[PDB]
Ligand binder design. Sequence first.
Ligand SMILES: O=C(O)c1ccc(/C=N/OCCO/N=C/c2cc(=O)[nH]c(=O)[nH]2)cc1
Length: 223
Amino acid sequence: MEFFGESWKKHLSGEFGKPYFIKLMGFVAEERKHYTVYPPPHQVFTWTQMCDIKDVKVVILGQDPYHGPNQAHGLCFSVQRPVPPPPSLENIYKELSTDIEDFVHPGHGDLSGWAKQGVLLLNAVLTVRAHQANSHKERGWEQFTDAVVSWLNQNSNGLVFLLWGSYAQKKGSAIDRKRHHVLQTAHPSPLSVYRGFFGCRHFSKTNELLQKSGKKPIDWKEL
Ligand SMILES: O=C(O)c1ccc(/C=N/OCCO/N=C/c2cc(=O)[nH]c(=O)[nH]2)cc1
């Protein structure tokens, strides 16, 4: 395997020599010497491994990785087999079931099948100390993932951005609405899901928007 997918590296490596990025790398490395940090190194950049950067169709922006054992693996909201889907992911699957009648629950929480279809599952902060939510907040990841969002905004066309919650909406605030499609709703967490996420129908809406972009739809059940 590779640490960082080649097509993504080609376009994002301009970040790597910048002072914030050097500092970020040092911070994460030091944290790993004293704490268990999730995801493990080989999974920090899973979101670069699943499809070519040129083939991104949909972008779902997250915040912090899961902080429990075996959960985070470098794709926002996803958990690898055999880990049970956390409540936020169960809510995502519940909305899918009501939104698209023909959706089939895969019986696991691994969203790799979406990533392979060009659904970028990007957290803003890409590491977290075990059991400590937001422990790596504002250490440099935000600037890096802002650079990712900026690259896609400028160099791709007709993407669908799904911005769930106020944090994601802020991170996507500068997306050019004349050049990309943006859908917004509340966050799927249990505390916020009934404040707009249930009933948002973003999955069916996304596929209709992809038609306008001249692109084939996501098969949301291909998991
Ligand atoms: O800004 C808001 O409106 C808002 C509201 C509620 C929340 C809540 N989060 O609660 C934790 C739920 O689980 N999240 C998992 C999770 C896993 C992952 O890979 N990425 C990720 O972004 N989240 C966040 C933002």
